[PDB]
From a paper:
Monoacylglycerol lipases (MGLs) resemble a major enzyme class involved in the hydrolysis of monoacylglycerols (MGs) to glycerol and FAs from intracellular and extracellular sources. Due to the increasing prevalence of multi-drug resistant Mtb strains, there is urgent need for the development of new drugs against tuberculosis. mtbMGL emerged as a new promising drug target due to its activity during the dormant and active stage, the reported role in host lipid degradation, membrane synthesis, and the observed severely changed phenotypical appearance of the mtbMGL ortholog in M. smegmatis. mtbMGL harbors an α/β hydrolase core consisting of 8 β-strands surrounded by 6 α-helices (Met1-Val137 and Ala194-Leu279) and a cap region (Ala138-Pro193) containing 3 α-helices. Residues Ser110, His256 and Asp226 form the active site in the core domain of mtbMGL.
The crystals of mtbMGL diffracted to a resolution of 1.8 Å. The cap-region has a Z like shape which resembles the specific architecture observed in other structurally characterized MGLs. The backbone nitrogen atoms of Met111 and Leu39 form the oxyanion hole that can stabilize the transition state intermediate during the catalytic reaction. The catalytic center is located in an approx. 18 Å deep cavity and can be reached from the outside in the observed open conformation via entry between the first and second stretch of the cap region (residues Ala138 to Arg173). The nature of the substrate-binding cavity is governed by predominantly hydrophobic side-chains located in the cap and core domains: Leu39, Ala136, Val137, Ala138, Ala139, Leu142, Val143, Val147, Ala148, Ala15, Leu154, Leu160, Val163, Phe168, Ile171, Val192, Ala194, Leu200, Leu201, Leu228 and Ile229, Pro230. The here presented crystal structure of mtbMGL corresponds to an open conformation in all three molecules of the asymmetric unit and enables a direct access path of the substrate to the catalytic sites. Based on the structural similarities of hMGL and mtbMGL it can be hypothesized that conformational changes in mtbMGL are also realized by a rolling movement of cap helix 1 similar to the one observed in hMGL. No comparable exit hole was observed in any of the molecules of the mtbMGL structure reported here. The mtbMGL crystal structure indicates a monomeric form of the lipase as analyzed with the PISA server, which is in agreement with the size exclusion chromatography of mtbMGL in solution.
Residue numbers in the entry: 1 to 139, 144 to 279
Amino acid sequence: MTTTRTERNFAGIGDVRIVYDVWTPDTAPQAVVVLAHGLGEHARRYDHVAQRLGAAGLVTYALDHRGHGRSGGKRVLVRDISEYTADFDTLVGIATREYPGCKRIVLGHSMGGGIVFAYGVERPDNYDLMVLSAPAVAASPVVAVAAKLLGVVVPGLPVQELDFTAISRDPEVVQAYNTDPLVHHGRVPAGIGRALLQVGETMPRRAPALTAPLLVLHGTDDRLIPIEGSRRLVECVGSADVQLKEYPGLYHEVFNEPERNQVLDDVVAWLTERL
């Protein structure tokens, strides 16, 4: 339809400047969506997702995490999962004040899915629906201990060598990712590894705190985050209205796959069922 983007910013944890987009369609908003991107990317890789949501009368708030895209902070530097979740909580507060009376939908992809889950456990009544795209949620006990120790002393130390070529079966998506100057083109730092384990170590203990309906999306050929971790999440959450949509043969970024228009139409159908 016609969904215009406006750029704003707020002060995050440590007074780090956090830039976010607001996508507004030319119609009375049916609900608001607060979107959390994954590791190394930024909110401008979701223009087509925000535009698709605007077609359904949804307003989308999408922020760049600290150390990502337009936001402040050292690139992909993080020391605690609470840094990500507090800034997401601040954005949800912004959207709640701007649109009172609208249902609140929290959407997260990959690391953003782990962020949205950690926020959702802390504030289970601050949102109405939750949608997760291959969430980084289930990350031996000795390696978990050592990784969280390292990430708390040298959170900027490179550790894990991630395969960007597994993000999508679309060659244009893999190419656009790799030539984007705003995108992180390095190894996973130790701080991000610790934050991921922080949501992973506590998922089965704290998943019962969730109450709002939940939809999980995951391609079966995901080589970055295994689909079995999503099968285990939906069995642990306390929410009664839960379902996981598996896309056979799709890669990590189901919103960027050639079948993205089918994936996005499944998300809009799920939301319209509950709005």
